[PDB]
């Protein structure tokens, strides 16, 4: 509908994540969620770097886009 839509779909394929979707408290919540999910999988990820790396890796693994 807008060119802004492209700016998302470009980013989403240039990089696994869209940083604009997880700013401020949205970032904090994400990490918290990841921690819980991490604990639910028997994994040990301590830092925000480890958690976010796992997040983006899983995104790259699971999401497929068909235009």
């Amino acid at each position: 509908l807008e060119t802004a839509f492209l700016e998302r779909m470009n980013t989403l394929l240039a990089n696994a994540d869209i940083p604009d979707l997880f700013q401020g408290e949205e970032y904090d919540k994400l990490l918290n969620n990841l921690r819980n999910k991490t604990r639910s999988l028997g994994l040990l990820l301590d830092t925000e770097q480890e958690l976010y790396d796992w997040f983006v890796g899983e995104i790259a693994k699971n999401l497929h886009v068909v235009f």
Partner: protein, 1121 residues
């Protein structure tokens, strides 16, 4: 304790406002304080209604003025905003005894105004406004009485304010000239006015400051009197005399009525205007010319029927000041607004409400800058005002509120048609105004009269020569945009003559020096020659201290004081004495920043004043971040960066700005949608007008510098207001720049002192000259001038040589010379030919070896240094043994010599802290090489951004949100305290150009590299960057959709070109891949070679066969393999 005290003084200790703020009063008692403070806007509007001039005060200003009714200190400080002509209130014994004008004139009141704590600001200010009107009238009455009795003009000027003496003189002149018009006796009266002119002109030389100003203005008026009287004396018939006399303004007094303040009126062309007796002080008066008089005639004709006045024409012809002088002649002061596209229906409607209720005359400057939509929408309000005045209505409705219509108002518009960024008025709006063309002012008369006032020996000859010389320059100079020799240039010359009168002696020498200082700094070589020759043809005929200050500043900072550099410093220094607005135009890297920093530092040495400089990047910031914005949802104004700086300077809470200069540098391209907002700031108005209604003055010591490299989209509206300094060529030679760069790089570091001598000897200018000269002949992809590539050479060479300090203590002289020589050759190679192709680089190695000497250490394709001894990369390539599954990995790079060379040079550049740009065809391996190089490091983390057409600075900052912390200027640091950040910028050249050809994101990156910081817009604070590096990559600026990047950006980064690997290289790489795969099926491993050959052959033939000339998406690259 601040917030409670602030709202207590405002809201707490006040039991009268509770009848209008009972909720906030109770809420304050309970106490959130901030929200209550923001909730008082309704009461502030109530208070504005009780004193219309309050519309020119901000909400904070009303809070202060309402609060401190017990001191009467703050109310004085706002006179400059409420009345304009009045600086302050003169109190005594808790009563007002007078007011002090801007020029320093003191107006006494007929009766002291007794003040009480219970009397609110609006009440006794209304009393003061009536008293000021009465006092001005009283002095007019008495002065006219004495002058008419036969008192001499020279013994009355020292007794009364300027307005009284002026209006008495005008009324008497009208009466006496009309009596002369009754007959043909004009000779006697011409002689009388001539004698008065001589007397005042001689008295001028023996006077105080105020008396001097009064006499100068009276001399302007009397020169007009004499010119008119002479013309009537020289008419042929009675009808000619009547025809001429009907066209000038006549000052009559209703001596037969009872109404005092309305007793004086002005007659012109059969129409009458009412004199107001508002106090205006002692403003600079305009020399009278025919154009000025005809403009007054049209304005009178329009005001007779209550139509809006309008002036149109090219920039620099005196429209707005004609409007102001008309207002001055009618005993009133015109409020001037600077229109912008930040205005909309609400802003213009509110401003019209203010002008309506005040009874003021308002002038809207640059009226075309309003967008089309608001120009259409506000026509209804314009029409309603006209109809209300014509009919005689008592109220009009604006913005859904009925407000009184003060029957004194007028609306004037000044517009420049046909300029970039301007719009067109719709027909139903133009029909409400009476237009008049102001295309060409009579510059000769202006020059003659100004010179006559200044006491020059021969005003006629000098005026003729000056105006003729300006015309000759405008006719003979080359065709360039920034050549304007119109009225503003004449005023610049004449104003610069004033401080130089005693330097040269009231003669031609002053004029020629002023001409040189004003005009030469803006000319090129051809036009410099033309100027000097023409000045010699037309005209007949000690800086040591500041020169030494400049020498000291330059040498201390470390910049070579070349002759060109000193010349430009001197021109800048002389220009900035009288110009508060300077533009510095020159090529990227030519030395504008060096020039203005050196000159300001020299001035600091000379005068002993402090210098605070703010550097703003106009294009990176949006207008709502630069000039501020009103949030209409709350009607709350919030300052931008420039507005915040100006407000803080004006506040001057600690007096820190009283013995200092304030410099604001706009370090980006001039843009007519940004800079024009400051028109009334740059020109004689010296006022910043904000949409909310505030009017911030510009201090006399507040200077603005513009730094750019072009004047393509800049209109004469800005070029003719600012003094312009033109840099034709770089300010210094290559040798001087290398000396500076080497000194700065070394100083940033016994051992280092002998190493410095060795390095300096190695950069022997003799051979570098030829190396640069023949380097200029190569093909440079996304290239930069040699002058802006030297920085990479020096920086990388110093870094590389210092990196081997640990092993220099045990070397002999030959070894030290060889290591230094090889490192400098390699650094020079990558600095000059780094952006060229492989064959060009090898040929350039050959030329380097040729010019540094047969007996020097040889540089070769793959030479290197190992722990010391000399070796080559070609012998240091390990083999790789992959397992089959590892062909699916993204982080595998099969090693090869060309890869090793790229990785080594990239890592060396990054360690030296030089920003990096990679350039090459798609798939050539830019990101792969950059990822592999930093993958195995322990010093850097990598943050990647993908740039695109519609990305902005916001995306770039958001990319660092999870990697960086803001730590109290403010600092931005990586979250980790052990590694730095390398911020990749993928496809840096895709972001599109705006309507004026600029990339805001690339300029933002330039600011990050050059200034190591940026402005945080919501808080308007400076953020310093400590440990973030900038690298990026792009395709060459020849592929479709790529935007060429300006030299001002690319000069700050080394550029490395990365082409495709050769056929044999691809064959070997993919043979290794197939060898890895065939481990799955080892019985076919004998076919590893032919399969790789087939794949590479098929790739090559597909790439050659199916080109983009068939389909836009037929792109083939090694990625497919």
């Amino acid at each position: 304790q601040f917030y409670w005290l602030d709202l207590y003084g405002i809201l707490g200790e006040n039991l009268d406002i509770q009848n209008f703020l009972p909720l906030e009063t109770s809420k304050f008692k309970s106490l959130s304080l901030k929200m209550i403070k923001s909730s008082l806007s309704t009461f502030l509007e109530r208070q504005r209604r009780q004193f219309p001039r309050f519309y020119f005060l901000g909400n904070d200003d009303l809070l202060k003025i309402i609060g401190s009714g017990k001191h009467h200190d703050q109310v004085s400080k706002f006179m400059k905003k409420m009345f304009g002509s009045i600086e302050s209130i003169i109190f005594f014994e808790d009563s007002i005894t007078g007011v002090r004008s801007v020029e320093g004139e003191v107006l006494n009141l007929n009766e002291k105004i007794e003040l009480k704590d219970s009397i609110q600001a609006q009440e006794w200010l209304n009393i003061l406004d009536t008293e000021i009107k009465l006092s001005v009238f009283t002095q007019f009455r008495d002065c006219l009485g004495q002058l008419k009795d036969g008192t001499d003009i020279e013994v009355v000027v020292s007794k009364y304010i300027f307005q009284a003496i002026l209006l008495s003189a005008q009324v008497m002149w009208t009466e006496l000239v009309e009596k002369c018009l009754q007959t043909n006796e004009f000779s006697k009266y011409w002689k009388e006015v001539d004698m008065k002119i001589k007397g005042l002109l001689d008295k001028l030389n023996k006077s105080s400051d105020n008396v001097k100003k009064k006499i100068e203005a009276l001399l302007v008026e009397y020169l007009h009197f004499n010119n008119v009287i002479g013309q009537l004396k020289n008419c042929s018939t009675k009808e000619e005399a009547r025809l001429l006399w009907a066209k000038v303004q006549k000052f009559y007094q209703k001596n037969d009525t009872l109404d005092d303040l309305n007793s004086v009126f002005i007659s012109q062309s059969g129409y009458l205007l009412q004199y107001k007796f508002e106090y205006i002080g002692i403003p600079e008066r305009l020399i009278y010319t025919p154009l000025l008089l005809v403009g007054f005639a049209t304005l009178t004709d329009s005001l007779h029927q209550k139509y809006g006045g309008c002036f149109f024409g090219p920039a620099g012809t005196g429209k707005t000041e004609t409007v102001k002088a008309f207002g001055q002649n009618l005993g009133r002061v015109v409020v001037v607004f600077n229109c912008d596209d930040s205005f909309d229906y609400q802003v213009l409607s509110r401003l019209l409400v203010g002008i309506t209720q005040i009874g003021a005359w308002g002038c809207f400057d640059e009226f075309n800058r309003l967008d089309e939509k608001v120009l259409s929408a506000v026509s209804a309000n314009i029409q309603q005002i006209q109809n209300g005045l014509q009919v005689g209505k008592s109220h009009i409705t604006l913005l859904e509120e009925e407000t009184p219509l003060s029957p004194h108002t007028a609306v004037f518009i000044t517009l420049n048609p046909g300029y970039n960024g301007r719009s067109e008025l719709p027909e139903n709006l133009k029909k409400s105004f009476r237009e008049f063309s102001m295309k060409s002012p009579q510059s000769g008369t202006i020059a003659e009269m100004i010179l006559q006032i200044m006491g020059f020996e021969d005003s006629k000859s000098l005026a003729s020569k000056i105006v003729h010389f300006l015309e000759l320059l405008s006719s003979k100079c080359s065709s360039m945009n920034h050549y304007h020799f119109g009225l503003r240039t004449l005023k610049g010359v004449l104003r610069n003559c004033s401080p130089l009168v005693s330097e040269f002696g009231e003669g031609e020498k002053t004029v020629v020096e002023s001409l040189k200082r004003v005009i030469l700094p803006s000319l090129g070589d051809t036009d410099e020659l033309v100027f000097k020759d023409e000045l010699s043809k037309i005209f007949d005929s000690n800086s040591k201290a500041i020169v030494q200050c400049l020498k000291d500043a330059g040498q201390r900072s470390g910049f070579s004081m070349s002759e060109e550099f000193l010349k430009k410093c001197m021109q800048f220094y002389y220009m900035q004495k009288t110009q508060q607005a300077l533009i510095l135009v020159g090529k990227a890297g030519c030395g504008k920043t060096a020039t203005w920093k050196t000159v300001i530092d020299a001035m600091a040495i000379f005068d002993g004043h402090a210098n605070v400089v703010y550097v703003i990047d106009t294009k990176v910031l949006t207008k709502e971040s630069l000039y501020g914005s009103m949030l209409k949802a709350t009607l709350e104004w919030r300052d931008g960066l420039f507005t915040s700086i100006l407000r803080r300077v004006n506040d001057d809470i600690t007096g820190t700005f009283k013995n200092s200069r304030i410099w604001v540098v706009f370090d980006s391209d001039l843009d007519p949608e940004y800079v024009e907002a400051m028109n009334s700031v740059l020109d004689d108005n010296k006022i910043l007008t904000l949409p909310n209604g505030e009017r911030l003055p510009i201090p006399p010591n507040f200077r603005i510098l513009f730094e750019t490299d072009n004047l393509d989209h800049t209109t004469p509206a800005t070029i003719t207001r600012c003094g312009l300094l033109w840099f034709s060529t770089d300010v210094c030679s290559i040798s001087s720049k290398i000396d500076h760069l080497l000194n700065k790089s070394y100083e940033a570091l016994f051992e280092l002192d002998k190493l410095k001598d060795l390095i300096s000897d190695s950069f022997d200018m003799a051979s570098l000259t030829n190396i640069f000269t023949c380097s200029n002949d190569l093909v440079h992809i996304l290239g930069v001038r040699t002058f802006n590539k030297l920085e990479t050479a020096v920086q990388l060479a110093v870094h590389l040589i210092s990196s081997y300090r640990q092993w220099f203590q045990n070397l002999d002289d030959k070894s030290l010379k060889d290591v230094i020589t090889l490192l400098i050759k390699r650094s020079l190679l990558y600095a000059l030919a780094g952006d060229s192709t492989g064959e060009s680089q090898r040929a350039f190695i050959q030329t380097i070896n040729t010019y540094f000497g047969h007996d020097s250490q040889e540089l070769s394709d793959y030479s290197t240094i190992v722990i010391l001894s000399f070796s080559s990369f070609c012998s240091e390539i390990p083999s790789v043994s992959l397992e089959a599954h590892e062909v699916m990995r993204p982080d595998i790079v099969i090693p090869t010599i060309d890869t090793i060379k790229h990785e080594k040079i990239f890592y060396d550049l990054l360690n030296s802290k030089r920003g990096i740009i990679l350039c090459g065809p798609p798939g050539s391996g830019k990101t792969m090489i950059m990822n592999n190089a930093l993958r195995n490091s322990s010093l850097y983390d990598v943050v990647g951004i993908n740039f695109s057409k519609d990305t902005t600075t916001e995306h770039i900052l958001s990319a660092l949100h999870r990697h960086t912390n803001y730590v109290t200027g403010l600092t931005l640091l990586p979250k980790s305290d052990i590694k730095n950040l390398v911020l990749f910028c993928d496809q840096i050249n895709l972001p599109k150009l705006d309507k004026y050809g600029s990339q805001n994101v690339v300029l933002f990156l330039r600011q990050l590299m050059e200034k190591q910081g940026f402005w945080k817009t919501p808080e308007n604070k400076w953020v310093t960057i400590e440990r973030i590096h900038i690298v990026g990559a792009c395709n060459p600026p020849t592929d479709p959709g790529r935007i060429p990047m300006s030299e001002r950006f690319t000069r700050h980064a080394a550029i490395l070109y990365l082409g495709y690997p050769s056929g044999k290289s691809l064959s070997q790489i993919y043979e290794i891949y197939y060898k890895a795969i065939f481990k799955l099926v080892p019985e076919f491993r004998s076919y590893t070679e032919p399969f790789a050959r087939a794949s590479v052959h098929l790739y090559n033939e597909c790439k050659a066969r199916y080109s983009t000339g068939l389909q836009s998406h037929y792109l083939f690259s090694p990625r497919e393999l």
